[PDB]
Ligand binder design. Structure first.
Ligand code: DUP
Ligand code: MG
Ligand code: MG
Ligand code: MG
Lengths: 131, 140
């Protein structure tokens, strides 16, 4: 009926490979955070490589097609994957946090407007521990 | 009637700031590539800073509560925001690309693990075909 969100996809992935994936916000052991840092560094370095390749081809006068974006699109999705993966392994619903960051950002795009409240992610962590 | 995805939220944001973005994959100018990279680096460094700080408190012997995770969760959401931001400015359906990367990643389940926990690829694993997703999106 409705496809899963990318965050729920990460929960399915971690369940399938036997990786920790708690239901509610859970303080992690150091080994988890180190790995999440390592995955983030690997995939952001691959994103950077594809942007450089595209910049170099443009500098040599190449006319990029839509097909030429496939490697960059692949790596930006890998970055999403490891970014969602960090939140999932922390037991933190990424959609709930994103929805609050988006509400703040979108709200700030009016006028910094009157009564603008920044993102309250701590309050999101609280509401997530009671559901 | 399916609720909005986070990729669809970025299209709403870019529209609301009048920088509205293409609906189909669209090669970008160089300045747009360099701008997205800057935003990636800035939020990546903010995420790296929060990870280092939680690791430093744990190393120091301090016990994290769930509420201690909010600065890191916040920066991880920011990094999603500018990563989805880049795909939207390229006219590329992030959800369509992600679904194909996800399919490829589920097939890794029988493979070994690296010492640090990273899932590695089983024998005969086949990569995602994101070129196929771009071609699909481009000819919609
Ligand atoms: O433990 C893992 C392993 C992989 N992944 C996902 C993230 C990303 O979608 C992809 C990255 O895994 P690899 O680094 O093994 N493959 P990649 O496509 O990045 O090729 P390479 O790293 O060799 O350039 O698999 C996880 O989420 N957790
Ligand atoms: Mg990799
Ligand atoms: Mg990659
Ligand atoms: Mg930030």
């Amino acid at each position: 009926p409705c496809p899963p969100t990318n965050a729920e996809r990460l929960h399915e992935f971690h369940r399938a490979i036997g990786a920790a994936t708690p239901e509610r916000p859970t303080p992690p052991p150091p080994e988890l955070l180190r790995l999440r840092q390592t995955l983030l560094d690997e995939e952001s370095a691959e994103v950077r490589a594809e942007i450089d390749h595209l910049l170099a081809r443009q500098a040599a006068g190449e006319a990029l097609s839509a097909g030429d974006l496939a490697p960059l699109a692949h790596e930006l999705a890998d970055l999403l994957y490891v970014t969602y993966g960090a939140l999932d392994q922390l037991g933190i619903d990424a959609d709930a946090v994103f929805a609050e960051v988006h509400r703040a950002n979108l709200s700030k795009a009016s006028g910094k407007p009157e009564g603008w409240r920044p993102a309250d992610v701590r309050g999101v962590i609280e509401r997530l521990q009671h559901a």
